Amino acid sequence: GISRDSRHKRSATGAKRAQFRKKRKFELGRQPANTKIGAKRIHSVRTRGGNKKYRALRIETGNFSWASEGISKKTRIAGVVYHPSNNELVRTNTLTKAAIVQIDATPFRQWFEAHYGQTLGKAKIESSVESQFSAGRLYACISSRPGQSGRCDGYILEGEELAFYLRRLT
Amino acid sequence: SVQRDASKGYSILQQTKLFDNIIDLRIKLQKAVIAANKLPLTTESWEEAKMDDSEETKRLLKENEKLFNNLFNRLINFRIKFQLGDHITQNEEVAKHKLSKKRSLKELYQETNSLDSELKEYRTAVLNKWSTKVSSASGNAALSSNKFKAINLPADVQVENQLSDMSRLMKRTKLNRRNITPLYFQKDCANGRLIDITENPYVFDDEDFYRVLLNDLIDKKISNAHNSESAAITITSTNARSNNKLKKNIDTKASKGRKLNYSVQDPIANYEAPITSGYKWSDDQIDEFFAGLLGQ
Amino acid sequence: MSELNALLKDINGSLTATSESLERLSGIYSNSATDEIPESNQLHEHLFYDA
Amino acid sequence: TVQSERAFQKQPHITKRWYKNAGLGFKTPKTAIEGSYIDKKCPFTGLVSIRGKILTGTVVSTKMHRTIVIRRAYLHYIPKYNRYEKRHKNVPVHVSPAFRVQVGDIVTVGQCRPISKTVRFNVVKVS
RNA sequence: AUGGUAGGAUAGUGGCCUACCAUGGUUUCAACGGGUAACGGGGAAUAAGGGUUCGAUUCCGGAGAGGGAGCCUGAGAAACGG
């Protein structure tokens, strides 16, 4: 029953709520479909006759890229640690767009050994991500909006993307 | 005719440049006008205000009196100098004697009535002359004589017809939109020496025409910022409207409901209506439980 | 710091604010009423031979 | 500096800064194409596209951040009064961080997938 | 309420909504406010081969199916065909 209609607002002057229509089918402000982590669940929603939106209610893995060589595998999720526009969204652990979520990127390491053949100090990458392949808790954002895609996509953070975000972590 | 037309154009702009410079006096005077309205109003409230900071208030009141009397003498002096140079005052000998005389407050009072009366006779001559000048030039005298007499009054006549009603326009200037309360205003009304605050007679906020004047400022300053820059287009004018009303006296959290609202929500009065003594103990042994805690 | 003290200095800061600007304004008006025209308007003397 | 919020911003661009040609006879200033501000809502090096309606007018207010108010006006001809009368309707437009815009400053504005409910136009050229 | 960015939602721009910021925007060229059986306006439409300017043509101002509340399918719709 949420409204997305434009006539509900006040004018640039601030006109006093002229009350022309009530709600119709066309301005159907849908519910906020906040997700969480867990076993994958899909809702199919029919809008505009033939457009099938995909509501992601629970999701467990994602396709996250690493831009320095341009590759992306399937990684199991761990948990969100920061979101820019909200803070209780993190405590809820609901994955929206641009949320900074932990993963255990073991097949990223397995690809790294299958492409280079050298252990990670237990052609090169900068030192601040060597702090947590030993921890095995790699940070990644969310690229796609999961509420209509029915998919979880992101990229691993790269260079200054850490150096601005652990600054915002602490 | 080219040199005679546009020599007046130098006279227009120099009068318009001098027009803008006097509004700079009108800009810089408002902090005195605002703080004067928060002064104590009665004779007795001045004395109680002089008790708290008695030595500090006495030098500043003498400093206020010296700076006001200095500013009052020179402004009469400039008004005498302006009316002589713009041939408003026909008596140069009387006006030149007033410039060299050290005047008290009452003599500056009486000379104000002298310069305003000479301006009044100059005004009714000018306003009747120029309203006749535009009506003959526009050609509407031969087309609008018999139908719209109530609207086509002369500009001098349109002035004095609004000067029939001093009463309503004096109800305008008591409108306290600023919510300014003078010192010991609450004590003086309670003592009978003097509540809808929206009309307050002892409060003198002439902001209504001054906001019109500041609207007249931004209309004339835009037209006079053509070449490089004028005196003050919007600096300390719209801000002067703001800080007297505390820029907007609004809170963003109270807007969104992100701040708590201490107002009655009119549907939710009495559905979950209260009960009897719902404490199954007699509440004084729980006071012992609250004094001597079973965790403390 | 009493409230009356803050009001009197607020008037005092505004009184000298109008005190210096009318010196500039009467300085402009004296230069526009006497024939000692400054260098910014020397062209008015050159344009009009009947000054 | 440019980084002043809780999230890094960069346009996906459908050279590290893709130049986009406006059309309608326009060209970027060199400050815009070699800048450092990101500003995806700016009509150049951003996802928004400039097209359609154009108008020119005078900036009347520039008091606050990244949008400005343009006074455009005309001596409007009332037919019954037989009078050209000046009428201004100050519309708010977006300003990009490529043009140090003050009041006055005749400019050109055009529609940019209108941003927030009154910002319908966007600056493209100063003079 | 005005913008900034982010997120949600939308078929989609969007303060539409939310988060956190900056405080602003419209005006004497009239912002806001009092009058209208606005069965009155609209070239909406041929005309009336002289009924003074129209006899006539139509768009027209909305809500609803006993009443609030929510849901449902269809390129159509918050249906009087649930």
PDB file of all heavy atoms in Angstrom, chain B residues 19-20 23 211-226 232-234, chain D residues 60 71 86 88, chain E residues 27-29:
ATOM      1  N   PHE B  19      21.630  56.878  -4.949  1.00  0.00           N
ATOM      2  CA  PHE B  19      20.496  56.144  -4.393  1.00  0.00           C
ATOM      3  C   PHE B  19      20.947  54.876  -3.684  1.00  0.00           C
ATOM      4  O   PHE B  19      20.508  54.600  -2.564  1.00  0.00           O
ATOM      5  CB  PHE B  19      19.487  55.801  -5.490  1.00  0.00           C
ATOM      6  CG  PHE B  19      18.305  55.004  -5.002  1.00  0.00           C
ATOM      7  CD1 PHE B  19      17.301  55.606  -4.258  1.00  0.00           C
ATOM      8  CD2 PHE B  19      18.187  53.656  -5.313  1.00  0.00           C
ATOM      9  CE1 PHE B  19      16.214  54.872  -3.812  1.00  0.00           C
ATOM     10  CE2 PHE B  19      17.099  52.919  -4.874  1.00  0.00           C
ATOM     11  CZ  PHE B  19      16.113  53.529  -4.123  1.00  0.00           C
ATOM     12  N   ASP B  20      21.850  54.116  -4.308  1.00  0.00           N
ATOM     13  CA  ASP B  20      22.292  52.845  -3.744  1.00  0.00           C
ATOM     14  C   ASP B  20      23.158  53.038  -2.507  1.00  0.00           C
ATOM     15  O   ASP B  20      23.204  52.156  -1.641  1.00  0.00           O
ATOM     16  CB  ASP B  20      23.060  52.050  -4.798  1.00  0.00           C
ATOM     17  CG  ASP B  20      22.232  51.770  -6.033  1.00  0.00           C
ATOM     18  OD1 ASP B  20      20.995  51.651  -5.910  1.00  0.00           O
ATOM     19  OD2 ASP B  20      22.819  51.682  -7.131  1.00  0.00           O
ATOM     20  N   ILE B  23      21.140  53.300   0.758  1.00  0.00           N
ATOM     21  CA  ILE B  23      20.623  52.021   1.244  1.00  0.00           C
ATOM     22  C   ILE B  23      21.707  51.259   1.997  1.00  0.00           C
ATOM     23  O   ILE B  23      21.411  50.396   2.830  1.00  0.00           O
ATOM     24  CB  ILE B  23      20.036  51.178   0.096  1.00  0.00           C
ATOM     25  CG1 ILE B  23      19.400  52.064  -0.963  1.00  0.00           C
ATOM     26  CG2 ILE B  23      18.958  50.257   0.627  1.00  0.00           C
ATOM     27  CD1 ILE B  23      18.950  51.306  -2.193  1.00  0.00           C
ATOM     28  N   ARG B 211      11.182  44.675   4.525  1.00  0.00           N
ATOM     29  CA  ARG B 211      11.244  43.542   3.606  1.00  0.00           C
ATOM     30  C   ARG B 211      10.809  43.953   2.205  1.00  0.00           C
ATOM     31  O   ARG B 211      11.352  43.454   1.213  1.00  0.00           O
ATOM     32  CB  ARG B 211      10.386  42.390   4.132  1.00  0.00           C
ATOM     33  CG  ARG B 211      10.461  41.099   3.352  1.00  0.00           C
ATOM     34  CD  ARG B 211       9.135  40.873   2.669  1.00  0.00           C
ATOM     35  NE  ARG B 211       9.084  39.638   1.903  1.00  0.00           N
ATOM     36  CZ  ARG B 211       8.196  39.410   0.947  1.00  0.00           C
ATOM     37  NH1 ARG B 211       7.330  40.338   0.579  1.00  0.00           N
ATOM     38  NH2 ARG B 211       8.184  38.227   0.342  1.00  0.00           N
ATOM     39  N   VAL B 212       9.822  44.851   2.106  1.00  0.00           N
ATOM     40  CA  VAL B 212       9.502  45.472   0.822  1.00  0.00           C
ATOM     41  C   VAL B 212      10.678  46.319   0.346  1.00  0.00           C
ATOM     42  O   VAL B 212      11.054  46.277  -0.832  1.00  0.00           O
ATOM     43  CB  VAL B 212       8.202  46.300   0.929  1.00  0.00           C
ATOM     44  CG1 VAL B 212       7.995  47.178  -0.302  1.00  0.00           C
ATOM     45  CG2 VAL B 212       6.998  45.397   1.133  1.00  0.00           C
ATOM     46  N   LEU B 213      11.295  47.080   1.264  1.00  0.00           N
ATOM     47  CA  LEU B 213      12.498  47.842   0.935  1.00  0.00           C
ATOM     48  C   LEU B 213      13.659  46.935   0.558  1.00  0.00           C
ATOM     49  O   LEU B 213      14.432  47.271  -0.346  1.00  0.00           O
ATOM     50  CB  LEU B 213      12.913  48.738   2.103  1.00  0.00           C
ATOM     51  CG  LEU B 213      12.940  50.248   1.864  1.00  0.00           C
ATOM     52  CD1 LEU B 213      13.524  50.965   3.071  1.00  0.00           C
ATOM     53  CD2 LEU B 213      13.726  50.585   0.606  1.00  0.00           C
ATOM     54  N   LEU B 214      13.809  45.798   1.237  1.00  0.00           N
ATOM     55  CA  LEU B 214      14.829  44.845   0.822  1.00  0.00           C
ATOM     56  C   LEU B 214      14.428  44.109  -0.449  1.00  0.00           C
ATOM     57  O   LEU B 214      15.300  43.657  -1.197  1.00  0.00           O
ATOM     58  CB  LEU B 214      15.140  43.868   1.956  1.00  0.00           C
ATOM     59  CG  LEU B 214      15.954  44.452   3.123  1.00  0.00           C
ATOM     60  CD1 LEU B 214      16.671  43.360   3.870  1.00  0.00           C
ATOM     61  CD2 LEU B 214      16.956  45.520   2.681  1.00  0.00           C
ATOM     62  N   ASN B 215      13.126  43.980  -0.712  1.00  0.00           N
ATOM     63  CA  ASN B 215      12.692  43.590  -2.049  1.00  0.00           C
ATOM     64  C   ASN B 215      12.909  44.728  -3.035  1.00  0.00           C
ATOM     65  O   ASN B 215      13.214  44.494  -4.210  1.00  0.00           O
ATOM     66  CB  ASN B 215      11.225  43.164  -2.037  1.00  0.00           C
ATOM     67  CG  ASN B 215      11.033  41.750  -1.529  1.00  0.00           C
ATOM     68  OD1 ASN B 215      11.663  40.811  -2.016  1.00  0.00           O
ATOM     69  ND2 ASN B 215      10.157  41.589  -0.545  1.00  0.00           N
ATOM     70  N   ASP B 216      12.749  45.972  -2.578  1.00  0.00           N
ATOM     71  CA  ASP B 216      13.100  47.113  -3.417  1.00  0.00           C
ATOM     72  C   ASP B 216      14.611  47.248  -3.542  1.00  0.00           C
ATOM     73  O   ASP B 216      15.111  47.826  -4.513  1.00  0.00           O
ATOM     74  CB  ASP B 216      12.491  48.397  -2.854  1.00  0.00           C
ATOM     75  CG  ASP B 216      12.371  49.492  -3.895  1.00  0.00           C
ATOM     76  OD1 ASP B 216      12.445  49.178  -5.101  1.00  0.00           O
ATOM     77  OD2 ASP B 216      12.203  50.667  -3.505  1.00  0.00           O
ATOM     78  N   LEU B 217      15.352  46.735  -2.556  1.00  0.00           N
ATOM     79  CA  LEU B 217      16.806  46.698  -2.665  1.00  0.00           C
ATOM     80  C   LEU B 217      17.254  45.744  -3.762  1.00  0.00           C
ATOM     81  O   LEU B 217      18.029  46.134  -4.640  1.00  0.00           O
ATOM     82  CB  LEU B 217      17.424  46.312  -1.318  1.00  0.00           C
ATOM     83  CG  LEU B 217      18.909  45.977  -1.179  1.00  0.00           C
ATOM     84  CD1 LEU B 217      19.461  46.643   0.052  1.00  0.00           C
ATOM     85  CD2 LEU B 217      19.098  44.484  -1.046  1.00  0.00           C
ATOM     86  N   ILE B 218      16.747  44.505  -3.755  1.00  0.00           N
ATOM     87  CA  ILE B 218      17.211  43.505  -4.715  1.00  0.00           C
ATOM     88  C   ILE B 218      16.715  43.814  -6.124  1.00  0.00           C
ATOM     89  O   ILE B 218      17.319  43.372  -7.108  1.00  0.00           O
ATOM     90  CB  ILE B 218      16.804  42.083  -4.275  1.00  0.00           C
ATOM     91  CG1 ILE B 218      15.282  41.936  -4.207  1.00  0.00           C
ATOM     92  CG2 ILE B 218      17.434  41.725  -2.941  1.00  0.00           C
ATOM     93  CD1 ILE B 218      14.815  40.514  -3.989  1.00  0.00           C
ATOM     94  N   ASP B 219      15.625  44.573  -6.254  1.00  0.00           N
ATOM     95  CA  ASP B 219      15.189  45.004  -7.578  1.00  0.00           C
ATOM     96  C   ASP B 219      16.095  46.102  -8.121  1.00  0.00           C
ATOM     97  O   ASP B 219      16.431  46.113  -9.311  1.00  0.00           O
ATOM     98  CB  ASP B 219      13.734  45.474  -7.530  1.00  0.00           C
ATOM     99  CG  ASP B 219      12.760  44.334  -7.310  1.00  0.00           C
ATOM    100  OD1 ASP B 219      13.088  43.189  -7.684  1.00  0.00           O
ATOM    101  OD2 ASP B 219      11.665  44.582  -6.762  1.00  0.00           O
ATOM    102  N   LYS B 220      16.504  47.036  -7.260  1.00  0.00           N
ATOM    103  CA  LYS B 220      17.371  48.118  -7.714  1.00  0.00           C
ATOM    104  C   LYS B 220      18.832  47.692  -7.779  1.00  0.00           C
ATOM    105  O   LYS B 220      19.586  48.219  -8.604  1.00  0.00           O
ATOM    106  CB  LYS B 220      17.211  49.343  -6.813  1.00  0.00           C
ATOM    107  CG  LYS B 220      15.834  49.989  -6.882  1.00  0.00           C
ATOM    108  CD  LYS B 220      15.621  50.716  -8.200  1.00  0.00           C
ATOM    109  CE  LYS B 220      16.551  51.910  -8.335  1.00  0.00           C
ATOM    110  NZ  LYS B 220      16.001  52.938  -9.262  1.00  0.00           N
ATOM    111  N   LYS B 221      19.256  46.749  -6.929  1.00  0.00           N
ATOM    112  CA  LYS B 221      20.650  46.314  -6.959  1.00  0.00           C
ATOM    113  C   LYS B 221      20.945  45.427  -8.161  1.00  0.00           C
ATOM    114  O   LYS B 221      22.071  45.440  -8.666  1.00  0.00           O
ATOM    115  CB  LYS B 221      21.017  45.571  -5.673  1.00  0.00           C
ATOM    116  CG  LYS B 221      21.306  46.483  -4.491  1.00  0.00           C
ATOM    117  CD  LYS B 221      22.476  47.408  -4.759  1.00  0.00           C
ATOM    118  CE  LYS B 221      22.884  48.152  -3.498  1.00  0.00           C
ATOM    119  NZ  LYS B 221      21.844  49.125  -3.064  1.00  0.00           N
ATOM    120  N   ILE B 222      19.962  44.643  -8.612  1.00  0.00           N
ATOM    121  CA  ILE B 222      20.123  43.865  -9.838  1.00  0.00           C
ATOM    122  C   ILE B 222      20.230  44.795 -11.042  1.00  0.00           C
ATOM    123  O   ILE B 222      21.070  44.597 -11.930  1.00  0.00           O
ATOM    124  CB  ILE B 222      18.965  42.852  -9.971  1.00  0.00           C
ATOM    125  CG1 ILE B 222      19.294  41.571  -9.200  1.00  0.00           C
ATOM    126  CG2 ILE B 222      18.643  42.517 -11.427  1.00  0.00           C
ATOM    127  CD1 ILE B 222      18.089  40.702  -8.908  1.00  0.00           C
ATOM    128  N   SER B 223      19.421  45.859 -11.060  1.00  0.00           N
ATOM    129  CA  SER B 223      19.464  46.814 -12.163  1.00  0.00           C
ATOM    130  C   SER B 223      20.715  47.688 -12.108  1.00  0.00           C
ATOM    131  O   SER B 223      21.088  48.305 -13.112  1.00  0.00           O
ATOM    132  CB  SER B 223      18.204  47.681 -12.149  1.00  0.00           C
ATOM    133  OG  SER B 223      18.281  48.676 -11.143  1.00  0.00           O
ATOM    134  N   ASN B 224      21.373  47.761 -10.950  1.00  0.00           N
ATOM    135  CA  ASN B 224      22.570  48.578 -10.808  1.00  0.00           C
ATOM    136  C   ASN B 224      23.857  47.767 -10.711  1.00  0.00           C
ATOM    137  O   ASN B 224      24.929  48.360 -10.545  1.00  0.00           O
ATOM    138  CB  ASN B 224      22.450  49.487  -9.582  1.00  0.00           C
ATOM    139  CG  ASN B 224      21.428  50.588  -9.778  1.00  0.00           C
ATOM    140  OD1 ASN B 224      21.323  51.164 -10.860  1.00  0.00           O
ATOM    141  ND2 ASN B 224      20.666  50.885  -8.731  1.00  0.00           N
ATOM    142  N   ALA B 225      23.785  46.437 -10.804  1.00  0.00           N
ATOM    143  CA  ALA B 225      24.974  45.600 -10.910  1.00  0.00           C
ATOM    144  C   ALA B 225      25.308  45.256 -12.354  1.00  0.00           C
ATOM    145  O   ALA B 225      25.846  44.174 -12.625  1.00  0.00           O
ATOM    146  CB  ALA B 225      24.806  44.323 -10.086  1.00  0.00           C
ATOM    147  N   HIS B 226      24.991  46.152 -13.290  1.00  0.00           N
ATOM    148  CA  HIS B 226      25.163  45.860 -14.707  1.00  0.00           C
ATOM    149  C   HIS B 226      26.627  45.899 -15.130  1.00  0.00           C
ATOM    150  O   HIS B 226      27.073  45.032 -15.889  1.00  0.00           O
ATOM    151  CB  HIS B 226      24.342  46.845 -15.543  1.00  0.00           C
ATOM    152  CG  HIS B 226      22.896  46.479 -15.662  1.00  0.00           C
ATOM    153  ND1 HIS B 226      21.898  47.423 -15.783  1.00  0.00           N
ATOM    154  CD2 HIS B 226      22.278  45.275 -15.682  1.00  0.00           C
ATOM    155  CE1 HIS B 226      20.728  46.814 -15.872  1.00  0.00           C
ATOM    156  NE2 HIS B 226      20.931  45.511 -15.812  1.00  0.00           N
ATOM    157  N   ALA B 232      25.495  46.082  -2.280  1.00  0.00           N
ATOM    158  CA  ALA B 232      25.108  44.837  -1.614  1.00  0.00           C
ATOM    159  C   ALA B 232      23.818  44.338  -2.259  1.00  0.00           C
ATOM    160  O   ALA B 232      22.739  44.869  -1.980  1.00  0.00           O
ATOM    161  CB  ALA B 232      24.937  45.049  -0.117  1.00  0.00           C
ATOM    162  N   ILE B 233      23.936  43.313  -3.103  1.00  0.00           N
ATOM    163  CA  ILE B 233      22.784  42.753  -3.802  1.00  0.00           C
ATOM    164  C   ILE B 233      21.951  41.920  -2.839  1.00  0.00           C
ATOM    165  O   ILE B 233      20.748  42.152  -2.681  1.00  0.00           O
ATOM    166  CB  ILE B 233      23.220  41.911  -5.015  1.00  0.00           C
ATOM    167  CG1 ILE B 233      23.960  42.779  -6.031  1.00  0.00           C
ATOM    168  CG2 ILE B 233      22.016  41.245  -5.663  1.00  0.00           C
ATOM    169  CD1 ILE B 233      25.438  42.481  -6.129  1.00  0.00           C
ATOM    170  N   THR B 234      22.581  40.937  -2.194  1.00  0.00           N
ATOM    171  CA  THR B 234      21.896  40.080  -1.237  1.00  0.00           C
ATOM    172  C   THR B 234      22.701  39.825   0.029  1.00  0.00           C
ATOM    173  O   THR B 234      22.206  39.130   0.924  1.00  0.00           O
ATOM    174  CB  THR B 234      21.534  38.729  -1.877  1.00  0.00           C
ATOM    175  OG1 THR B 234      22.586  38.315  -2.758  1.00  0.00           O
ATOM    176  CG2 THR B 234      20.223  38.825  -2.650  1.00  0.00           C
TER     177      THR B 234
ATOM    178  N   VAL D  60      20.755  34.021 -11.061  1.00  0.00           N
ATOM    179  CA  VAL D  60      20.290  34.949 -10.045  1.00  0.00           C
ATOM    180  C   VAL D  60      20.668  34.507  -8.630  1.00  0.00           C
ATOM    181  O   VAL D  60      20.847  35.364  -7.755  1.00  0.00           O
ATOM    182  CB  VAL D  60      18.763  35.171 -10.180  1.00  0.00           C
ATOM    183  CG1 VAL D  60      17.956  33.919  -9.820  1.00  0.00           C
ATOM    184  CG2 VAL D  60      18.281  36.404  -9.404  1.00  0.00           C
ATOM    185  N   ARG D  71      17.558  33.223 -13.465  1.00  0.00           N
ATOM    186  CA  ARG D  71      16.500  34.131 -13.879  1.00  0.00           C
ATOM    187  C   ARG D  71      16.513  34.237 -15.397  1.00  0.00           C
ATOM    188  O   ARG D  71      17.462  34.771 -15.981  1.00  0.00           O
ATOM    189  CB  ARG D  71      16.684  35.511 -13.254  1.00  0.00           C
ATOM    190  CG  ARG D  71      15.741  36.567 -13.814  1.00  0.00           C
ATOM    191  CD  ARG D  71      15.580  37.740 -12.865  1.00  0.00           C
ATOM    192  NE  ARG D  71      15.195  37.328 -11.522  1.00  0.00           N
ATOM    193  CZ  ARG D  71      14.709  38.151 -10.604  1.00  0.00           C
ATOM    194  NH1 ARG D  71      14.542  39.440 -10.851  1.00  0.00           N
ATOM    195  NH2 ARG D  71      14.384  37.670  -9.407  1.00  0.00           N
ATOM    196  N   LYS D  86       7.974  43.085 -18.323  1.00  0.00           N
ATOM    197  CA  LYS D  86       8.989  42.130 -17.905  1.00  0.00           C
ATOM    198  C   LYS D  86       8.430  41.191 -16.845  1.00  0.00           C
ATOM    199  O   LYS D  86       7.843  41.636 -15.856  1.00  0.00           O
ATOM    200  CB  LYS D  86      10.212  42.869 -17.363  1.00  0.00           C
ATOM    201  CG  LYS D  86      11.350  41.963 -16.927  1.00  0.00           C
ATOM    202  CD  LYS D  86      12.698  42.636 -17.134  1.00  0.00           C
ATOM    203  CE  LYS D  86      13.834  41.780 -16.598  1.00  0.00           C
ATOM    204  NZ  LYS D  86      13.442  41.042 -15.366  1.00  0.00           N
ATOM    205  N   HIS D  88       9.796  37.566 -14.803  1.00  0.00           N
ATOM    206  CA  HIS D  88      10.803  36.546 -14.573  1.00  0.00           C
ATOM    207  C   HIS D  88      10.208  35.376 -13.800  1.00  0.00           C
ATOM    208  O   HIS D  88       9.382  35.556 -12.901  1.00  0.00           O
ATOM    209  CB  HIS D  88      12.021  37.112 -13.828  1.00  0.00           C
ATOM    210  CG  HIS D  88      11.723  37.610 -12.445  1.00  0.00           C
ATOM    211  ND1 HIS D  88      11.500  38.941 -12.168  1.00  0.00           N
ATOM    212  CD2 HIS D  88      11.631  36.961 -11.259  1.00  0.00           C
ATOM    213  CE1 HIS D  88      11.275  39.090 -10.875  1.00  0.00           C
ATOM    214  NE2 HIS D  88      11.347  37.903 -10.301  1.00  0.00           N
TER     215      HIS D  88
ATOM    216  P     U E  27      10.279  33.863  -8.431  1.00  0.00           P
ATOM    217  OP1   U E  27      10.675  33.822  -9.862  1.00  0.00           O
ATOM    218  OP2   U E  27      11.266  34.281  -7.403  1.00  0.00           O
ATOM    219  O5'   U E  27       9.000  34.801  -8.291  1.00  0.00           O
ATOM    220  C5'   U E  27       9.130  36.163  -7.913  1.00  0.00           C
ATOM    221  C4'   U E  27       8.086  36.545  -6.898  1.00  0.00           C
ATOM    222  O4'   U E  27       8.180  35.665  -5.751  1.00  0.00           O
ATOM    223  C3'   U E  27       8.207  37.939  -6.308  1.00  0.00           C
ATOM    224  O3'   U E  27       7.661  38.930  -7.159  1.00  0.00           O
ATOM    225  C2'   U E  27       7.481  37.800  -4.972  1.00  0.00           C
ATOM    226  O2'   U E  27       6.076  37.884  -5.152  1.00  0.00           O
ATOM    227  C1'   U E  27       7.834  36.364  -4.575  1.00  0.00           C
ATOM    228  N1    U E  27       8.965  36.285  -3.619  1.00  0.00           N
ATOM    229  C2    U E  27       8.662  36.393  -2.276  1.00  0.00           C
ATOM    230  O2    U E  27       7.527  36.558  -1.865  1.00  0.00           O
ATOM    231  N3    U E  27       9.737  36.304  -1.428  1.00  0.00           N
ATOM    232  C4    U E  27      11.059  36.123  -1.769  1.00  0.00           C
ATOM    233  O4    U E  27      11.910  36.065  -0.882  1.00  0.00           O
ATOM    234  C5    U E  27      11.294  36.012  -3.174  1.00  0.00           C
ATOM    235  C6    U E  27      10.266  36.090  -4.025  1.00  0.00           C
ATOM    236  P     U E  28       7.990  40.485  -6.927  1.00  0.00           P
ATOM    237  OP1   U E  28       8.368  41.071  -8.235  1.00  0.00           O
ATOM    238  OP2   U E  28       8.927  40.632  -5.784  1.00  0.00           O
ATOM    239  O5'   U E  28       6.583  41.102  -6.513  1.00  0.00           O
ATOM    240  C5'   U E  28       5.643  41.504  -7.501  1.00  0.00           C
ATOM    241  C4'   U E  28       5.247  42.955  -7.365  1.00  0.00           C
ATOM    242  O4'   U E  28       5.014  43.251  -5.966  1.00  0.00           O
ATOM    243  C3'   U E  28       6.283  43.964  -7.849  1.00  0.00           C
ATOM    244  O3'   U E  28       5.613  45.122  -8.350  1.00  0.00           O
ATOM    245  C2'   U E  28       7.026  44.324  -6.565  1.00  0.00           C
ATOM    246  O2'   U E  28       7.647  45.590  -6.583  1.00  0.00           O
ATOM    247  C1'   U E  28       5.911  44.250  -5.519  1.00  0.00           C
ATOM    248  N1    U E  28       6.368  43.824  -4.190  1.00  0.00           N
ATOM    249  C2    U E  28       5.744  44.347  -3.077  1.00  0.00           C
ATOM    250  O2    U E  28       4.846  45.164  -3.148  1.00  0.00           O
ATOM    251  N3    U E  28       6.215  43.881  -1.873  1.00  0.00           N
ATOM    252  C4    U E  28       7.223  42.961  -1.678  1.00  0.00           C
ATOM    253  O4    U E  28       7.546  42.630  -0.538  1.00  0.00           O
ATOM    254  C5    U E  28       7.809  42.460  -2.878  1.00  0.00           C
ATOM    255  C6    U E  28       7.374  42.901  -4.058  1.00  0.00           C
ATOM    256  P     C E  29       5.202  45.254  -9.904  1.00  0.00           P
ATOM    257  OP1   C E  29       6.185  46.145 -10.566  1.00  0.00           O
ATOM    258  OP2   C E  29       3.758  45.595  -9.946  1.00  0.00           O
ATOM    259  O5'   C E  29       5.363  43.791 -10.520  1.00  0.00           O
ATOM    260  C5'   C E  29       4.531  43.367 -11.600  1.00  0.00           C
ATOM    261  C4'   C E  29       4.903  42.001 -12.140  1.00  0.00           C
ATOM    262  O4'   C E  29       6.026  42.122 -13.053  1.00  0.00           O
ATOM    263  C3'   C E  29       5.302  40.954 -11.101  1.00  0.00           C
ATOM    264  O3'   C E  29       4.808  39.669 -11.484  1.00  0.00           O
ATOM    265  C2'   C E  29       6.827  40.958 -11.177  1.00  0.00           C
ATOM    266  O2'   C E  29       7.438  39.751 -10.774  1.00  0.00           O
ATOM    267  C1'   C E  29       7.063  41.248 -12.656  1.00  0.00           C
ATOM    268  N1    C E  29       8.342  41.911 -12.941  1.00  0.00           N
ATOM    269  C2    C E  29       9.462  41.130 -13.214  1.00  0.00           C
ATOM    270  O2    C E  29       9.353  39.898 -13.186  1.00  0.00           O
ATOM    271  N3    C E  29      10.641  41.732 -13.483  1.00  0.00           N
ATOM    272  C4    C E  29      10.717  43.062 -13.500  1.00  0.00           C
ATOM    273  N4    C E  29      11.898  43.617 -13.774  1.00  0.00           N
ATOM    274  C5    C E  29       9.586  43.886 -13.236  1.00  0.00           C
ATOM    275  C6    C E  29       8.428  43.273 -12.967  1.00  0.00           C
TER     276        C E  29
END
